[PDB]
Design an enzyme around this catalytic site. Structure first.
Site, PDB file in Angstrom:
ATOM      1  N   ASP D  60       0.660  -1.112  -0.016  1.00 29.17           N
ATOM      2  CA  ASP D  60      -0.175  -0.461  -0.323  1.00 29.17           C
ATOM      3  C   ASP D  60       0.632   0.978   0.386  1.00 29.17           C
ATOM      4  O   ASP D  60       0.877   1.970   0.703  1.00 29.17           O
ATOM      5  CB  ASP D  60      -0.461   0.485   0.717  1.00 29.17           C
ATOM      6  CG  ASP D  60       0.085  -0.044   2.891  1.00 29.17           C
ATOM      7  OD1 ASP D  60       1.434   0.079   2.261  1.00 29.17           O
ATOM      8  OD2 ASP D  60      -0.832   0.154   3.558  1.00 29.17           O
ATOM      9  N   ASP D  66     -10.186   6.250  -4.184  1.00 30.02           N
ATOM     10  CA  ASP D  66     -10.567   7.958  -3.443  1.00 30.02           C
ATOM     11  C   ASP D  66     -10.484   8.659  -3.956  1.00 30.02           C
ATOM     12  O   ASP D  66     -10.351  10.128  -4.534  1.00 30.02           O
ATOM     13  CB  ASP D  66     -10.847   6.861  -2.352  1.00 30.02           C
ATOM     14  CG  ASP D  66     -12.379   8.275  -2.067  1.00 30.02           C
ATOM     15  OD1 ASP D  66     -13.160   9.053  -2.241  1.00 30.02           O
ATOM     16  OD2 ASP D  66     -13.198   6.940  -0.857  1.00 30.02           O
ATOM     17  N   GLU D  89     -15.834  16.032  -0.381  1.00 28.11           N
ATOM     18  CA  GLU D  89     -15.877  15.423   1.130  1.00 28.11           C
ATOM     19  C   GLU D  89     -14.638  15.154   1.265  1.00 28.11           C
ATOM     20  O   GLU D  89     -14.096  14.483   2.616  1.00 28.11           O
ATOM     21  CB  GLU D  89     -16.903  14.170   0.885  1.00 28.11           C
ATOM     22  CG  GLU D  89     -16.776  13.013   0.956  1.00 28.11           C
ATOM     23  CD  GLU D  89     -17.374  12.373   1.258  1.00 28.11           C
ATOM     24  OE1 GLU D  89     -18.523  11.854   1.768  1.00 28.11           O
ATOM     25  OE2 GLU D  89     -16.602  11.619   0.087  1.00 28.11           O
ATOM     26  N   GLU D  90     -13.556  15.266   0.291  1.00 27.86           N
ATOM     27  CA  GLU D  90     -12.287  14.707   0.279  1.00 27.86           C
ATOM     28  C   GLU D  90     -11.555  16.128   1.027  1.00 27.86           C
ATOM     29  O   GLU D  90     -10.341  15.706   0.966  1.00 27.86           O
ATOM     30  CB  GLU D  90     -11.241  13.439  -0.801  1.00 27.86           C
ATOM     31  CG  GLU D  90     -11.135  12.343  -0.452  1.00 27.86           C
ATOM     32  CD  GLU D  90     -12.945  11.768  -0.037  1.00 27.86           C
ATOM     33  OE1 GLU D  90     -13.494  10.980  -0.907  1.00 27.86           O
ATOM     34  OE2 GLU D  90     -13.834  11.469   1.206  1.00 27.86           O
ATOM     35  N   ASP D 110     -19.031  14.280  -4.122  1.00 27.33           N
ATOM     36  CA  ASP D 110     -18.541  13.172  -3.514  1.00 27.33           C
ATOM     37  C   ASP D 110     -17.650  11.819  -4.702  1.00 27.33           C
ATOM     38  O   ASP D 110     -18.385  11.433  -5.389  1.00 27.33           O
ATOM     39  CB  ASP D 110     -18.938  12.865  -2.678  1.00 27.33           C
ATOM     40  CG  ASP D 110     -19.183  11.591  -1.995  1.00 27.33           C
ATOM     41  OD1 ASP D 110     -17.857  10.913  -2.329  1.00 27.33           O
ATOM     42  OD2 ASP D 110     -19.942  11.146  -0.883  1.00 27.33           O
ATOM     43  N   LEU D 112     -16.201   9.908  -4.989  1.00 28.01           N
ATOM     44  CA  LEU D 112     -15.931   7.875  -4.851  1.00 28.01           C
ATOM     45  C   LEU D 112     -16.899   8.082  -3.512  1.00 28.01           C
ATOM     46  O   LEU D 112     -16.414   8.425  -2.825  1.00 28.01           O
ATOM     47  CB  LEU D 112     -15.400   7.530  -4.712  1.00 28.01           C
ATOM     48  CG  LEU D 112     -15.227   5.979  -5.449  1.00 28.01           C
ATOM     49  CD1 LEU D 112     -15.539   6.176  -6.772  1.00 28.01           C
ATOM     50  CD2 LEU D 112     -13.940   5.655  -5.621  1.00 28.01           C
ATOM     51  N   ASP D 113     -18.169   7.156  -3.980  1.00 24.67           N
ATOM     52  CA  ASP D 113     -18.626   7.407  -2.704  1.00 24.67           C
ATOM     53  C   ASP D 113     -19.568   5.776  -2.089  1.00 24.67           C
ATOM     54  O   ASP D 113     -19.653   4.901  -3.958  1.00 24.67           O
ATOM     55  CB  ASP D 113     -20.763   8.289  -2.747  1.00 24.67           C
ATOM     56  CG  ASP D 113     -21.185   8.006  -1.666  1.00 24.67           C
ATOM     57  OD1 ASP D 113     -22.723   7.069  -2.318  1.00 24.67           O
ATOM     58  OD2 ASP D 113     -21.269   8.235  -0.434  1.00 24.67           O
ATOM     59  N   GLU D 272     -24.149  14.444  -0.707  1.00 31.02           N
ATOM     60  CA  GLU D 272     -24.964  13.605  -0.420  1.00 31.02           C
ATOM     61  C   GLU D 272     -26.283  13.504  -0.551  1.00 31.02           C
ATOM     62  O   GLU D 272     -27.395  13.438  -1.740  1.00 31.02           O
ATOM     63  CB  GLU D 272     -24.248  12.800   0.247  1.00 31.02           C
ATOM     64  CG  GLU D 272     -22.803  12.723   0.131  1.00 31.02           C
ATOM     65  CD  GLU D 272     -22.708  11.629   1.409  1.00 31.02           C
ATOM     66  OE1 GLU D 272     -22.994  12.066   2.514  1.00 31.02           O
ATOM     67  OE2 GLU D 272     -21.727  10.127   1.052  1.00 31.02           O
TER      68      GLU D 272
HETATM   69  O1  LIG Z   1     -23.055   1.996   7.160  1.00 33.21           O
HETATM   70  P1  LIG Z   1     -23.997   3.004   6.864  1.00 33.21           P
HETATM   71  O2  LIG Z   1     -23.838   3.268   8.645  1.00 33.21           O
HETATM   72  O3  LIG Z   1     -25.218   1.935   6.953  1.00 33.21           O
HETATM   73  O4  LIG Z   1     -23.467   3.710   5.859  1.00 33.21           O
HETATM   74  C1  LIG Z   1     -24.312   3.331   4.481  1.00 33.21           C
HETATM   75  C2  LIG Z   1     -23.979   4.826   3.965  1.00 33.21           C
HETATM   76  O5  LIG Z   1     -22.989   5.961   3.958  1.00 33.21           O
HETATM   77  C3  LIG Z   1     -22.450   5.893   2.900  1.00 33.21           C
HETATM   78  O6  LIG Z   1     -21.096   5.177   2.580  1.00 33.21           O
HETATM   79  C4  LIG Z   1     -21.704   7.691   3.444  1.00 33.21           C
HETATM   80  O7  LIG Z   1     -20.888   7.924   2.318  1.00 33.21           O
HETATM   81  C5  LIG Z   1     -23.348   6.168   1.909  1.00 33.21           C
HETATM   82  O8  LIG Z   1     -22.562   5.721   0.498  1.00 33.21           O
HETATM   83  C6  LIG Z   1     -24.264   5.058   2.166  1.00 33.21           C
HETATM   84  O9  LIG Z   1     -26.176   5.162   1.674  1.00 33.21           O
HETATM   85 MG   LIG Z   2     -16.567  10.039  -1.203  1.00 29.15          MG
HETATM   86 MG   LIG Z   3     -20.625   9.459  -0.267  1.00 28.39          MG
END
Ligand SMILES: O=P(O)(O)OC[C@H]1O[C@](O)(CO)[C@@H](O)[C@@H]1O
Ligand SMILES: [Mg+2]
Ligand SMILES: [Mg+2]
Ligand SMILES: Nc1ncnc2c1ncn2[C@@H]1O[C@H](COP(=O)(O)O)[C@@H](O)[C@H]1O
Ligand SMILES: Nc1ncnc2c1ncn2[C@@H]1O[C@H](COP(=O)(O)O)[C@@H](O)[C@H]1O
Ligand SMILES: Nc1ncnc2c1ncn2[C@@H]1O[C@H](COP(=O)(O)O)[C@@H](O)[C@H]1O
Ligand SMILES: Nc1ncnc2c1ncn2[C@@H]1O[C@H](COP(=O)(O)O)[C@@H](O)[C@H]1O
Ligand SMILES: O=P(O)(O)OC[C@H]1O[C@](O)(CO)[C@@H](O)[C@@H]1O
Ligand SMILES: O=P(O)(O)OC[C@H]1O[C@](O)(CO)[C@@H](O)[C@@H]1O
Ligand SMILES: O=P(O)(O)OC[C@H]1O[C@](O)(CO)[C@@H](O)[C@@H]1O
Ligand SMILES: [Mg+2]
Ligand SMILES: [Mg+2]
Ligand SMILES: [Mg+2]
Ligand SMILES: [Mg+2]
Ligand SMILES: [Mg+2]
Ligand SMILES: [Mg+2]
Lengths: 327, 327, 327, 327
Positions: D60, D66, D89-90, D110, D112-113, D272
């Site tokens: 790594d 990301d 977000e980052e 965001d 990469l979500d 988001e």
């Molecule tokens: O595991 P949890 O608390 O459900 O979080 C899931 C949510 O968290 C996130 O990854 C936040 O970015 C969303 O993409 C997703 O809906």
């Molecule tokens: Mg993100």
């Molecule tokens: Mg997100």
């Protein structure tokens, strides 16, 4: 049925009762050739031009297509566990493979041919020759100095309008076309046979002033046929792989004879002439220096050159006969 | 920064204060050319050889690259809403766009050039010229008959080792590399100028017996330079777009002069000669029939042919001098 | 060294002294899976939407991703010359392979799983199980009715954010990631072992009203741990391949138990439960119906269903113990 | 006809009589998203595992998806010359674009979500919202603090089985499929409306112990509908963009309500919640915190969180009624 390169080599290793080492070798080659095709077609070049800034190499390094080809081939061949000695156009000395990775095969290769055609985007390719080791001695340069007649397999990869790998072995030449959407080579022409006689000649006429008398005479005759028929058409891409491939598929003749600057000829015998001459012979074609068969020359230098004329049998003999006459 | 063809085109349209209709047009052209590039490289070819079964169409039942190319071009271009008249090497008559889809541009193109080179996997290309429709009357084939001098834009896509789009407009010639991993053309070479004098000559010498004496004399100097300098090298791919592009990038000269079977030259005025002369000119080179500028010819048939000599200015100039001298 | 799927299977066939038939089979699977990945990622979809007009099928035919998957798998397996009987989710009757193409292996497969997730672009996959034929009789449905314990190989292909093929055989589970630029599967995780205990549970809670008492009790405990620690996180993609893969790589438990509408359970035993349960066992995990091991059920109907709970050993036993207690 | 994202964007810009700066901006966004899509699908991953040798960076050492995503976004967007303020977000602070590259737009994204889903190959996405900078004063972080009501455009790219870009503006929501063979997004679904009432519920039930009573009651009706209709199905991918997109396409409801460890909800207002509420609204659905419209919240921190309930109008409306009833 549909035949992929991968199924073809495996079905031919099974038929041959091979332990698989060679199969593994060819499967390597086939992976190296895809890796090379993708790089040649410039996938990912946006990253060179900064699509994501310039954070990505903190190191100062980016590879010439030439160097990268060579890396891919060496590493991929070494990984097959099937080779003992490699000869590259790019290395002054034969490469002896580490014992823990050593197999029984010797590979001579041009990682990328057609370099004067790289920057203008004309076709380029990869040319390979495979021998089995003779000796029981520790592998050395000696093992690569075998005459062509001794090849086990040969062929080339062309990166043109599309990518094609051509493979010749004892029982013929087959052409497989790369489908880049699934990464698979698809058998597309089986057991290929070159036309007896073609209507194209391929030579760099810019050396006209330096050709021996028989070429001059032969070229004249292609342009002013004594029987008063239609003149051959001329084609000379500038890349051996491309002119050789057109030659196989359309027929005709390709020439690289001795001149002032190269009186032994330009092209290398081990990883240019030999492989192309083996392909040419399995397909019923001829490959001569003008004085001897190319595959019968026993090399003494891994980087030795030789003149070559290759192609359709009637055309190449027509040229040989001029030589015979002049002598 | 990084400059994609899409951003270049858009920014140039913004600077020239276009209504956006020409932008829309080059955008289409950029998409046409990516879709041809992928068909050319044989993606999904596995489906033709029955990978998913239903082998039923085999041999020559289905649509040749040439036809697919033509279709992509016609359909992508009509969809831009920017054209009224299209002329294609592959159509006997001009195509007149439906009123509901009419824009103000005329386009002449050769959807796939270098067809003798298709089956052998040599480089192939697409050539285009764009015109602004002058007449107020009903759009028609005579709309496509402007001299090359009148082009708003011309250029080509070469499908070679890698795919490149070369585009020329009033303010210069630019080279964009296609990164096929993201479907984006990347500006790679900007405001290109061809060098004053090259050392490569391009011609089919097979026709040596049919050449006029200027051509004949010129070849002689190339091989046997009277002042004993190094002789030129010869290169002739057999695909106009490949030979021309090498000529732009590397300098030198390209000829398809008149011969007996082609008293007017073989190449087409509207969609091979014109665009290429325009690119060559905007690059600082010359394009002549031997007697007049290609771009000034007044075309009388949409499939008319012309003799064409182009490339490095000093090289073409030397050849014009041989023409003049030979009365 | 770098290991490709193709070199891995070949190196494992060599080690096993296999004649190669199975190697050929797996190499088939690997080609089928790429073909499927490309189609799933929608390459060439512009042609569906008319990029080149609609001249291209004069025939009225275009394939569902579902049907096409099935075609690819059948044809590609049949081509390997290594199978005698195939079982598809899509065919009411086992497929008996023609004698001229017949080998010794039986393959059960789901060509594409996760169909309620197709139109919304969520992850889907392919699930396969391989047996050797027992009988010496003419191959029949009987040959496919073997218990899971009898599998020779199993795994699946996931098409998610990227494409991964997972393969389990006698000596472990390995994950290979598809690199779509060169069409090669690259060994990326070796000899994979599932975590003893996870922190995720995966079930469709919309059937809450129909779960037996032990699930209800187990779900409660995941949400309100008696030891007052942190509740498990919930995840249920809706595609067995995706929830199963997350389970292998992160640990946790996946459940599909009997309900009102499916009192024998939803998932198929032959080409859903069995393969996933074999993978799960090679990786040190458990797969139970809640009453018996999944791999020990001897099927009587090629399309028979079974409830399944699978995952980390501590979590699945925790659930088994609730069952044991309730009984 | 066929409508590519590039032609749609251009034509909409022409109809609205834009100067072209917003077009340039969405064009960049379209290119950003293709470059992320290819990195996500792991192309050229073979180079990381030493296919061309020089194994030296392992484990790594090198750049996570990301980070690459973030970089592509920032660099592609600055290059459009259309932005002044970016919030990601980052990044802890807003990014203020250099004067020489300033345009008038603000973008919150965001890159990469669904990061919990990266290592397991589940669907992941990119979310974006675009604002028109109102103040005449120096551009700054407060420029990014407009309520969602103010968005000019918002949407997302889902990297799923296939890559899709969903884009919403004042005149509706459109779905474009990415055909990765030509690098073009194809308009696939036009002017999308979410259905009035779905039958899927999406939530992480792991948090059941932390839920408010409205949420708790609502889940009950879903599993044990008092009127004895069919119970809803549950689906929860763990990636917002995946859950939301299923919700748009299939109808139903998505919740990330407040819990104890997240008194304000977990999801981020600016990149988001806002974009997703905007898409949902323009589609005919609702997006609420349980008490107020998401889009009307007045953001005070660029990384502020909010509770979010969205989807089919009747489903959200039923849940708001439970909120009201529970005082
Ligand atoms: O595991 P949890 O608390 O459900 O979080 C899931 C949510 O968290 C996130 O990854 C936040 O970015 C969303 O993409 C997703 O809906
Ligand atoms: Mg993100
Ligand atoms: Mg997100
Ligand atoms: N895949 C193959 N295709 C063609 N011939 C093969 C193959 N494998 C083995 N052979 C023949 O068998 C010899 C020894 O095979 P091997 O045991 O693989 O080194 C080779 O040198 C070939 O002549
Ligand atoms: N994208 C562009 N690049 C360069 N010049 C353009 C562009 N768009 C328009 N122009 C110039 O402006 C004229 C009118 O533009 P249009 O309104 O798009 O037809 C064209 O003939 C071009 O000369
Ligand atoms: N590529 C391979 N990988 C793992 N095991 C194999 C392979 N090839 C053969 N075997 C083992 O050898 C048995 C018979 O092989 P075969 O002769 O190929 O049918 C198989 O059923 C496997 O257990
Ligand atoms: N490509 C486009 N699509 C939709 N609307 C646009 C576009 N370009 C501009 N507009 C509208 O016109 C306004 C000004 O455009 P611009 O001059 O490009 O900033 C924007 O805020 C949009 O509302
Ligand atoms: O320009 P010349 O001297 O004709 O050399 C051309 C030859 O050079 C090479 O690049 C040397 O490998 C060949 O591929 C090609 O045929
Ligand atoms: O074989 P010939 O007569 O040299 O023709 C070659 C020329 O013909 C063309 O194919 C005409 O399209 C050109 O691409 C090429 O330059
Ligand atoms: O919606 P349900 O009933 O939970 O079914 C989901 C299951 O259905 C299947 O599509 C059936 O193959 C599985 O991949 C998936 O886990
Ligand atoms: Mg070389
Ligand atoms: Mg060479
Ligand atoms: Mg043509
Ligand atoms: Mg042409
Ligand atoms: Mg299925
Ligand atoms: Mg299924």
């Amino acid at each position: 049925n549909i035949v992929t390169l991968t199924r073809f080599v495996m079905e031919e290793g099974m038929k041959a009762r091979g332990t698989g080492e060679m199969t593994q070798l060819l499967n390597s080659l086939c992976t190296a050739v895809k890796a090379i095709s993708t790089a040649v077609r410039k996938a990912g070049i946006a990253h060179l031009y900064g699509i994501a800034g310039s954070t990505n190499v903190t190191g100062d390094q980016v590879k010439k297509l030439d160097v990268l080809s060579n890396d891919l081939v060496i590493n991929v061949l070494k990984s097959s566990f099937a080779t003992c000695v490699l000869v590259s156009e790019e290395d002054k000395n034969a490469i002896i493979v580490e014992p823990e990775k050593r197999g029984k095969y010797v590979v001579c290769f041009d990682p990328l041919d057609g370099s004067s055609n790289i920057d203008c985007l004309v076709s380029i390719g990869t040319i390979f020759g495979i021998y089995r080791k003779n000796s029981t001695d520790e592998p050395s340069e000696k093992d690569a100095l075998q005459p062509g007649r001794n090849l086990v397999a040969a062929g080339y990869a062309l990166y043109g309008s599309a990518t094609m790998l051509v493979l010749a072995m004892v029982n013929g030449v087959n052409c497989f076309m790369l489908d880049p959407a699934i990464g698979e080579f698809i058998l597309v022409d089986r057991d290929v046979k070159i036309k007896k006689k073609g209507s194209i000649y391929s030579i760099n006429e810019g050396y006209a002033k330096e050709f021996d008398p028989a070429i001059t005479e032969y070229i004249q005759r292609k342009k002013f046929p004594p029987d008063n028929s239609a003149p051959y058409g001329a084609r000379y891409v500038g890349s051996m792989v491309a002119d050789v491939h057109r030659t196989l598929v359309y027929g005709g003749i390709f020439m690289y004879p001795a001149n002032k600057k190269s009186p032994k000829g330009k092209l290398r015998l081990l990883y240019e002439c030999n492989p192309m001459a083996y392909v040419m012979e399995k397909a019923g074609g001829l490959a001569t220096t003008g004085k001897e068969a190319v595959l019968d020359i026993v090399p003494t230098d891994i980087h030795q050159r030789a003149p070559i004329i290759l192609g359709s049998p009637e055309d190449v003999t027509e040229l040989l006969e001029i030589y015979q006459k002049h002598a």
